[PDB]
Amino acid sequence: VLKQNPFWWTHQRHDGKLWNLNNYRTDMIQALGGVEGILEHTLFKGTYFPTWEGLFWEKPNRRFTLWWSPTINRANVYVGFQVQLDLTGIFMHGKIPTLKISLIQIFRAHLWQKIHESIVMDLCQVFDQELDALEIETVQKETIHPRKSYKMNSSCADILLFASYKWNVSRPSLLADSKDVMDSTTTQKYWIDIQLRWGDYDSHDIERYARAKFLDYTTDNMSIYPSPTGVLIAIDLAYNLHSAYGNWFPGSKP
Amino acid sequence: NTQELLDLLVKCENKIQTRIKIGLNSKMPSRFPPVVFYTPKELGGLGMLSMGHVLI
């Protein structure tokens, strides 16, 4: 027979089965960090399925590297890097052509700009539906540069709220900061930002990313903003995480 | 009992991991996170049975 047989000595049928390793697989899963800990490095959270039990595969290198991308293209694995893909806000630490082709095909036809536009207009419709009760004069769609959707180094204005009054806004606090202290100041125009990112395994913390982006862009020169008071909403498309750190006027946070 | 076989097994495990690394990318990495190989096949990973002292 043309195949070299590792089991030249035993027959499954006559001897039975001389070893079992299901326990090995289960202990392997446990030691890897649980099913969830295994899946955190995966792109699963970017697929936004609710749970992992009800799925199946279809019987792969390309699928294998794309599915394990958020833990492979991390800055720790490859250094001296962060060349950015075109028309996209994604960072590929290291030249990973297979991940690169997967990432272009997964973002074809100006898809990143479409997400930015859609998030903007949906939040605009939300604020139009909630204009009067929040004491909003109007909502202004800021002139957004076509490449602003994939402009990481700096940022510009996206959505503006005019009050027709002077809003009382609070200190810059995260979207979940139910306990927020008053800023002891007032403002009339309120800015909102839509920041998109592809969190890798090590830097998928949307809260820290949002806080850093808000505190850097507000104190930045290539980031012209109509008012010091506003919010910067960072949305991690990679793990479908979101957080906003900027100031909050009454009713704005909930 | 055979020590040379333990050393050989670890060397060959590293060789398999390194060939996977080279197939995945041309440049050789630093601290490739091992959960890529050892994750069970039904959970996406390759499913490498280990015979070495690899620490997670």
Binding site: - | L6, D7, L9, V10, N14, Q17, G52, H53
Partner: peptide
């Protein structure tokens, strides 16, 4: 913490060849 395997020679003092070896139950 490098990801390369380490030679098991000398790191097995605390284990036996069968420790954690389990036999499946009837199906």
């Amino acid at each position: 913490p490098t990801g390369e395997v380490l030679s098991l020679v000398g790191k097995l003092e605390g284990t036996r060849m069968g420790d954690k070896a389990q036999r499946t139950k009837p199906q």
